[PDB]
Amino acid sequence: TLEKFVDALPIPDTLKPVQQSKEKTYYEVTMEECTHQLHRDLPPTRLWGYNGLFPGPTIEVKRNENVYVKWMNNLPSTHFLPIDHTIHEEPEVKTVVHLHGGVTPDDSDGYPEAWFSKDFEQTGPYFKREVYHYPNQQRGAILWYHDHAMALTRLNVYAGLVGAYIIHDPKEKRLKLPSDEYDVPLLITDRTINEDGSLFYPSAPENPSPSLPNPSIVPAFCGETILVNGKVWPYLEVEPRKYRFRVINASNTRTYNLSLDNGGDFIQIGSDGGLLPRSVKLNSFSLAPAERYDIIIDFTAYEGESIILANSAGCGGDVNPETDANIMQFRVTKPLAQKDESRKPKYLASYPSVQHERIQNIRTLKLAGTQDEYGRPVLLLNNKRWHDPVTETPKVGTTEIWSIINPTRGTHPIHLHLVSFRVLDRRPFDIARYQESGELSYTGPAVPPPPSEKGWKDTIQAHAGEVLRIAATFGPYSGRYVWHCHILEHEDYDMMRPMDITDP
Ligand SMILES: [Cu+]
Ligand SMILES: [Cu+]
Ligand SMILES: [Cu+]
Ligand SMILES: [Cu+]
After folding, report:
1. Ligand nearest to the CA of 148
2. Consecutive H or E run containing 331
3. Using CB atoms within 10 A as the burial measure, which of 1, 224, 290, 374 is most buried?
4. Are residues 140 and 273 in the same domain?
């Protein structure tokens, strides 16, 4: 229904520090209930936002900048979305901020049980500090921050609690990539919106078996509408030149498969973990929840054109050409402000291969689940609940191969905190046999990663009927972290596990 391409794409302002010196940068971000218009033709929407903004302000830091952010909850004491009480005396509204892809001390990582309520009145069992510490001793990259509170993540994020966080490495400046105004984040979230403009989040699955509690969690969420940077199907006026985009899938469930309707190419220059070693010319790319693509789009040859960023991946069905087949629209009509001095270099960074690592351990992990007393699917990593004693206990400074078995019907974007990792390969196997006997026979050879996945990843798509192998060096910090599916509906029930990085 909503008319496509009638609102300009908002560019979230960069957060200004409360105090800053050479030794440290200090920010304050408070979560607020606020209203914002999401489309020219809608009444304002009630949202929860970092500093009352949706998306939250973009935070920009340098490699090794010593940063502190005091994340504060100043939200209402009751939620506005359907809470399922059967899945977890504590406050109804709990929040904790996770800097996804951050190389972070464990008590600044936004552990699900380090949640806090309004003004920190009550705090979860794993809470230690108000002011998070981000030393940012990691590669230049696109991070994003979002809520991570136990049993509430799918809800708090859907409410609007997402933002971008960029680490700039000054040594990457020589590459001369598009920058400043020509470097633009795109946070993509699908939403379903009611006529009065309020957010809709389902309080039960369709055909609620009379067994189900009310509200009941749902296995997956697909929105009828795509937003980018907080506007339904927006347009961006661009100059006819090279642009850099930080593409972030900030949606609960939905996977995008992006292309340009004029047949133009993306130049991939970066993955979750930063610059790829070599740029990759791409015609389409898959982007599952929490994945990030750092791309250049060359508008030089398309002056005057309107180009749709299009999507082909279904979400609980085929794309509707009028709705979710559309993400946004570029209009190459802005006059040049100056000569395009930016570059699209082939040679970007050292290969991850350059470093030789002793494999200390090899974990086999399965994506499984069971069914609760109401008949619902309960998703589990290794048939273990979140509350079960920890089993993933890598040693600090060591490298493991994780071997992720997926006998389910769907893809799972598996995310590991603290570390970025590389991809080894994927291999199809007999699902019926694995389920019958617990034994694994591969039905075809190993497939190494495409160039897209030959850098550093931290969220990785594990396709159905495959075994995915990744290699991660755990460090530099020890402590209590998490690994989980990043489909929020899965994560909350109950596809999330503790991870202890140990000291010897
Ligand atoms: Cu995340
Ligand atoms: Cu994360
Ligand atoms: Cu999942
Ligand atoms: Cu997480």
Report:
1. 4
2. strand 326-331
3. 290
4. no
Q: Which of 328, 349, 370 is the last residue of a domain?
A: 349
Q: How far apart are CA 74 and CA 34, in angstroms?
A: 11
Q: How far is CA 427 from CA 102, 182, 424, in A?
A: 30, 39, 10
Task: List the determination method.
Answer: X-ray
3 alpha carbon – ligand 1 mean position (Å): 31
Locate 474 and state its tokens. 């755990």
Flag whether 100 is marked binding. Answer: yes
The answer to whether 495 is annotated as binding is: yes
From 114, 143, 168, the end of a domain falls on: 168
| Residue 347 φ then ψ, to 5° | -90, 115
Helix (H) or strand (E) holding 154: helix 153-158
Cβ proximity of 316 and 222 under 8 Å: yes
Task: Output phi, psi for 456, to 5 deg.
Answer: -115, 130
- Quote the CA–CA distance of 342 and 344 in Å, as a whole number: 7
Domain that holds residue 395: 350-504
For residue 112, give the nearest of 100, 102, 124 by alpha carbon: 124
**401 and 276 both lie in a single domain:** no
Q: List, as ranges, residues with CB under 5 A of the ion ligand 2.
A: 100, 417
Residue 413 pairs in a beta bridge with 461
CA 292 to ligand 2 centroid distance, Å: 12
152 class by beta-carbon count within 10 Å (0-12 exposed, 13-18 middle, 19+ buried): buried
Secondary structure string (H, E, C) spanning 166-219: EEECHHHHHHCCCCHHHEEEEEEEEEEECCCCCEECCCCCCCCCCCCCCCCCCC
**Which residues are CB-contacts of 152 (< 8 A; sequence separation ≥ 6)?**
79, 83, 93, 94, 95, 115, 492
